[PDB]
Write a protein that binds this ligand. Structure first.
Ligand SMILES: *[C@@H]1O[C@H](CO[C@@H]2O[C@@H](C)[C@@H](O)[C@@H](O)[C@@H]2O)[C@@H](O[C@@H]2O[C@H](CO)[C@@H](O)[C@H](O)[C@H]2NC(C)=O)[C@H](O[C@@H]2O[C@@H](C)[C@@H](O)[C@@H](O)[C@@H]2O)[C@H]1NC(C)=O
Ligand SMILES: *[C@@H]1O[C@H](CO)[C@@H](O[C@@H]2O[C@H](CO)[C@@H](O[C@@H]3O[C@H](CO)[C@@H](O)[C@H](O)[C@@H]3O)[C@H](O)[C@H]2NC(C)=O)[C@H](O)[C@H]1NC(C)=O
Ligand SMILES: *[C@@H]1O[C@H](CO[C@@H]2O[C@@H](C)[C@@H](O)[C@@H](O)[C@@H]2O)[C@@H](O[C@@H]2O[C@H](CO)[C@@H](O)[C@H](O)[C@H]2NC(C)=O)[C@H](O)[C@H]1NC(C)=O
Ligand SMILES: *[C@@H]1O[C@H](CO)[C@@H](O[C@@H]2O[C@H](CO)[C@@H](O)[C@H](O)[C@H]2NC(C)=O)[C@H](O)[C@H]1NC(C)=O
Ligand SMILES: *[C@@H]1O[C@H](CO)[C@@H](O[C@@H]2O[C@H](CO)[C@@H](O)[C@H](O)[C@H]2NC(C)=O)[C@H](O)[C@H]1NC(C)=O
Ligand SMILES: *[C@@H]1O[C@H](CO)[C@@H](O[C@@H]2O[C@H](CO)[C@@H](O)[C@H](O)[C@H]2NC(C)=O)[C@H](O)[C@H]1NC(C)=O
Ligand SMILES: *[C@@H]1O[C@H](CO)[C@@H](O[C@@H]2O[C@H](CO)[C@@H](O)[C@H](O)[C@H]2NC(C)=O)[C@H](O)[C@H]1NC(C)=O
Ligand code: NAG
Ligand code: NAG
Ligand code: NAG
Lengths: 637, 175, 13
């Protein structure tokens, strides 16, 4: 006691940057009459310290003056969450009776001494969240009584010691955040009591040991973010107690093992980000407990099995970024608990099944870049729980106002590159949480419902490449949160509303290829974030307003194919960031202002088909201009 | 992906009172569907338009993970901290607009690797140091501005800076 | 301390 307490008191002297408010103020009297009862963090047995608990004590120092020789009876040591720096001395293995060893969350460096292997009585080993480098010693396999080994979040290298098969009592192996190398020892598959194996986020090469079929007690197998190769061993199906299997972000090849159906407890399967090929085994429909099924970003082929209808508890089905084909079986959306259905980047065909939102809980549906056709199922129209909908790049058809209902929780929708006809329903206004409405390249006619502007939360609106008619109201100001407005390629007519002035958060304006007919608003001088403005192919009929030059941040400004007349104001020199200018196909007269030579950012100009004259100012843009950039003028020197 | 995780690092080191970065959903494959971010046909981020966003915080070294990023607009905010030298990893690059901020520290010499750079505006800041010689080797720099900043040393005309005007170096306390 | 690793969900479009 007195020898132990004085030795601890000497070790405490090593501590640096220690405040008088520390918990170790109780270390005053070395007599057992205060050592074993009033000293914080120590607990004795038969008068001798067996327990040292100094977690989260803010101690700053090293274990160089740790009294190894003075504390024979230590069995519990937890020095985690402190500022200990240095190495792990081999003297740590001298604690014969030690059962619990925790040095996690520290600033330790160096290797793990093999002397830790002679801690025969050790049950738990925690060396977590440190910067220990080197290979795990083979001698760790000597810890026959160990049950949990956690050395993750470190800088460990080399292979896993195949002597780990000798750790029969091990139930929890945590080594994930590290740089372990080489193949997985086959002996690891022969741990009888193992329950959790987390080898993820490493540099592990080679195949997955077929011996893993013997782990009938394992419920968690995390080995993602590795360089594992070969094929998934079919003996994995014998892992009948598996709850979560994650091999994502690997270099696995070959087909999915049909033996995965035998695991009736598997609720999470993450096979994505790999190179598995072939067809989906119909036996995957027999994985009864499956909740999260992710096989995305692969090279799978063939159709989805109709057996997927037997997955009655599925919630996430990730099949995107693959080479699957054929029709969608109605059983895919059989689940009433389905919430996420990602299918983009595939080669599917045919109609959507009427079971699409059977349970009324679908949130995120993704169908981009496919060959779907036919109408939207009535179950999708009435499915109010949608959040993200992505129909982009298909051949969907039907009346756009008859296809979709109301969606109070809708956030993002993209129906671009489809064959939807009809006029826009005013039902979209009730999607008060919508921030991105993108419906470009369709066959939609009619006018924009005035209620669309009462959707104040919109930040991106894209109705481009359609046949929308009518004129934009001065109520356009109601969506001032917008930053991308793409209304180009339509039959919008009338004057451009002056309410565009008040959309100050606007970044990108595209009103081109339309039938706007009167003069540009002279009040458009307050767009401090606009870097794009395309007003080309219209009928604007007067002089360019001076207020346009007050938008300092334009990079591109296209006013081509118009009826603009008058002289090009010299105040365009103020646009210091302007890179592109297109004023072609107009009736602009006068001389090109020679103050344009001072616009260093300008690179591209087109002034063709106009009524200007005089020698052009000399800048980088005018010099490299081809002969097309000056065609059809009057007297350009 | 990689680019989306990189931009997510920025999102966590900035205070966003105006909810500008709200659309930046980390669980998406790419950040190309985010607002204020634009990609090219390859789904690589090429533009970040965060000017006048009332963003306070510190820059992030993950900004060098955007190989195709051409235009970086962080101007007109209350961002503090230093400029991480890792922005020199932006192989393709046109515009660096960091002006009108509260940035401090030196100007990293690693910006000389951005040989495609055309416009660099860092004025109205708290920058301190000297102009690297490396910035004279870009040969593509057209517009330059380091006004309203306490730097030191002489104006390096090493060849490229010969075309520039004292307005680029006004109120700089250089000479 | 000790804790397991959580396989994070895949991405999305
Ligand atoms: C494991 O890492 C030890 C610590 O090196 C440093 O740790 C941090 C402080 C950080 O700065 C990190 O970047 C450094 O790498 C190495 O020991 C140190 O080695 C350096 C020389 O590299 C030496 O100046 C130090 O005195 C020495 N300190 C101690 C306490 O030993 C280990 O040794 C290395 O391993 C050799 C095989 C070789 O690679 C050589 O570079 C080192 O001596 C590192 N062990 C490894 C990498 O196995
Ligand atoms: C289906 O819809 C979208 C698909 O992207 C996902 O919604 C988004 O989920 C993310 C991650 O949870 C949410 O971000 C989080 O916000 C909380 C604060 O509320 C924050 O603490 C987290 O750090 C993170 O930023 C995001 O808010 C949410 N967006 C919306 C509008 O829902 C959703 O997760 C998907 N559901 C699935 C995958 O089942
Ligand atoms: C667009 O909305 C405005 C007003 O916004 C809403 O108005 C109410 C209907 C209610 O939902 C509030 O919470 C919103 O702020 C409409 O203009 C108002 O309409 C009401 C009719 O209930 C009328 O009493 C007001 O005088 C109107 N004006 C104002 C300034 O409130 C407008 O009709 C909506 N446009 C369309 C096409 O529906
Ligand atoms: C604390 O350590 C002391 C010193 O090792 C132990 O005293 C020894 O006890 C063993 C049996 O447990 C005897 O065989 C030795 O002869 C003892 N040596 C001395 C010098 O006394 C003591 O038993 C330990 N106490 C506990 C509770 O483990
Ligand atoms: C060692 O000390 C820590 C904290 O000083 C103890 O952790 C507490 O444990 C109890 C029971 O498990 C919990 O109710 C508390 O919430 C924990 N506090 C924390 C984590 O800050 C730990 O039990 C101690 N161990 C021994 C053997 O005494
Ligand atoms: C999709 O729908 C249901 C799944 O709920 C299946 O139809 C029957 O559902 C009842 C539910 O009480 C079960 O008891 C029956 O066994 C199911 N039928 C059969 C033949 O098993 C349907 O089979 C599922 N799959 C499809 C339509 O492919
Ligand atoms: C503004 O939008 C128009 C289209 O409305 C763009 O015009 C295109 O110009 C290129 C260049 O010759 C042609 O190949 C395309 O056919 C044109 N599109 C159409 C629909 O005719 C114009 O380029 C845009 N301006 C800017 C600066 O982006
Ligand atoms: C699982 O562990 C228990 C612990 O008591 C053991 O009895 C049983 O034999 C083990 N079964 C296997 C090897 O899966
Ligand atoms: C493990 O699965 C294989 C299928 O590849 C099977 O042949 C074998 O019998 C299974 N193991 C046991 C003990 O049944
Ligand atoms: C949609 O875009 C494609 C190519 O982008 C083109 O065929 C046309 O502009 C549109 N096609 C249909 C069918 O809408």
């Amino acid at each position: 006691t007195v020898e132990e307490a004085n030795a601890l008191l000497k070790w405490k002297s090593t501590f640096t940057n220690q405040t008088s408010s520390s918990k170790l103020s109780s270390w005053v009297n070395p007599n057992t009459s205060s050592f074993c009862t009033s000293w914080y963090g120590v607990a004795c047995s038969l008068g001798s310290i067996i327990r040292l608990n100094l977690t989260n004590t803010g101690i700053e120092g090293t274990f160089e003056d740790f009294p190894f020789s003075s504390l024979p009876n230590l069995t519990f040591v937890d020095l985690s969450m402190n500022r200990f720096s240095g190495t792990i001395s081999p003297e740590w293995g001298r604690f014969s009776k030690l059962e619990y060893f925790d040095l996690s969350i520290n600033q330790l460096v160096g290797e793990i001494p093999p002397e830790l292997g002679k801690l025969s009585n050790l049950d738990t080993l925690h060396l977590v969240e440190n910067k220990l480098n080197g290979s795990i010693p083979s001698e760790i396999g000597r810890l026959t009584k160990v049950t949990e080994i956690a050395i993750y979040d470190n800088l460990l290298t080399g292979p896993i010691p195949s002597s780990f098969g000798n750790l029969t009592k091990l139930v929890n192996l945590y080594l994930f955040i590290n740089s372990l190398s080489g193949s997985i020892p086959s002996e690891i598959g022969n741990l009888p009591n193992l329950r959790e194996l987390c080898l993820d986020r490493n540099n592990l090469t080679g195949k997955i040991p077929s011996s893993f079929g013997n782990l009938k007690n394992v419920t968690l197998l995390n080995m993602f973010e590795n360089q594992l190769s070969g094929e998934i061993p079919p003996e994995i199906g014998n892992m009948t107690a598996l709850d979560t299997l994650s091999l994502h972000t690997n270099k696995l090849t070959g087909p999915i093992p049909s033996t995965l159906g035998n695991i009736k407890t598997l609720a999470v399967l993450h096979l994505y980000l790999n190179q598995l090929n072939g067809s989906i085994p119909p036996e995957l429909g027999e994985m009864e407990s499956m909740i999260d099924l992710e096989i995305s970003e692969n090279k799978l082929t063939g159709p989805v099995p109709d057996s997927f209808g037997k997955l009655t508890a599925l919630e996430w089905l990730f099949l995107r970024d693959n080479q699957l084909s054929g029709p969608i079986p109605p059983g895919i959306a059989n689940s009433t608990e389905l919430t996420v259905l990602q299918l983009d980047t595939n080669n599917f065909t045919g109609f959507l099944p009427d079971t699409i939102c059977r349970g009324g809980k679908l949130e995120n549906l993704t169908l981009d870049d496919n060959h779907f056709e036919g109408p939207v199922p009535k179950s999708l129209r009435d499915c109010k729980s949608l959040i993200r909908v992505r129909f982009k790049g298909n051949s969907f058809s039907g009346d756009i106002s008859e296809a979709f209902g109301v969606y109070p929780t809708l956030n993002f929708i993209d129906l671009s590159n489809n064959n939807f006809h009809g006029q826009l329903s005013a039902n979209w206004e009730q999607s008060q949480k919508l921030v991105a409405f993108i419906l470009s390249n369709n066959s939609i006619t009619g006018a924009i419902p005035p209620e669309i502007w009462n959707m104040t939360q919109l930040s991106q609106l894209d109705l481009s490449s359609n046949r929308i008619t009518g004129e934009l109201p001065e109520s356009i100001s109601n969506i001032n949160r917008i930053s991308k407005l793409q209304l180009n390629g339509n039959r919008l007519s009338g004057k451009i509303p002056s309410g565009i002035r008040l959309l100050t958060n606007l970044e990108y304006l595209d009103l081109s290829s339309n039938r706007f007919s009167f003069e540009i608003p002279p009040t458009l001088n307050n767009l401090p974030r606009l870097y794009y403005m395309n007003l080309s192919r219209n009928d604007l009929d007067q002089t360019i307003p001076e207020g346009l030059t007050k938008l300092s941040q334009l990079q591109m400004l296209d006013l081509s194919y118009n009826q603009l007349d008058g002289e090009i104001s010299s105040q365009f020199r103020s646009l210091q960031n302007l890179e592109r200018l297109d004023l072609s196909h107009n009736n602009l007269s006068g001389q090109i202002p020679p103050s344009f030579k001072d616009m260093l950012a300008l690179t591209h100009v087109d002034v063709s088909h106009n009524n200007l004259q005089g020698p052009i100012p000399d800048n980088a843009a005018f010099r490299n201009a081809p002969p097309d950039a000056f065609e059809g003028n009057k007297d350009l020197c | 992906n990689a680019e989306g995780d990189a931009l997510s690092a920025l999102k966590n080191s900035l205070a966003d009172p105006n909810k500008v970065l709200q659309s930046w959903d980390a669980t998406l494959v790419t950040p190309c569907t985010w607002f204020h971010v634009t990609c090219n046909s390859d789904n690589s981020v090429t533009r970040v338009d965060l000017g006048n966003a009332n963003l306070s915080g510190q820059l992030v070294m993950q900004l060098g993970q955007l190989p195709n990023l051409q235009y970086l607009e962080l101007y007109s905010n209350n961002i503090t901290g230093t400029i991480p030298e890792q922005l020199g990893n932006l192989t393709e690059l046109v515009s660096l607009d960091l002006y009108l901020n509260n940035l401090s520290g030196p100007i990293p010499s690693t910006l000389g690797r951005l040989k495609k750079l055309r416009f660099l505006r860092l004025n109205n800041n708290s920058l301190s140091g000297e102009i690297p010689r490396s910035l004279t080797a870009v040969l593509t720099l057209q517009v330059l501005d380091l006004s309203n900043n306490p730097l030191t040393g002489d104006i390096p005309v090493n060849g490229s800076f010969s075309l520039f005007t004292p307005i680029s170096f006004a109120n700089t306390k250089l000479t | 301390e000790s804790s397991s690793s959580h396989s994070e969900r895949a991405g999305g479009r």
